């Protein structure tokens, strides 16, 4: 039963790596989104501040 006890661990490592890389790609995606949102908000703030001049 130890052979299957190592087989299930071997299989679990694969899915753990998959979820790891997927999670990192998710983080980077979220960073890019937040960067674009930040740039847009800052530009709109500059526009509304120039609106008073």
């Amino acid at each position: 039963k130890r052979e299957v006890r190592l087989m299930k661990n071997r299989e679990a490592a694969r899915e753990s790596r998959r979820k790891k890389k997927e999670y990192v790609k998710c983080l980077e995606n979220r960073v890019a989104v937040l960067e674009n949102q930040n740039k847009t908000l800052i530009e709109e703030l500059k526009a509304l501040k120039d609106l008073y001049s």
Partner: peptide, 27 residues
């Protein structure tokens, strides 16, 4: 790259937030 971009975006953000007082005063 991440630290440089973060420092740049934080620089522009800080500069933008510096001018809300005069904004609400002149408004």
């Amino acid at each position: 790259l991440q630290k440089q971009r973060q420092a740049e975006e934080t620089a522009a953000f800080e500069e933008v937030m510096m001018d809300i007082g005069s904004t609400r005063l002149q408004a």
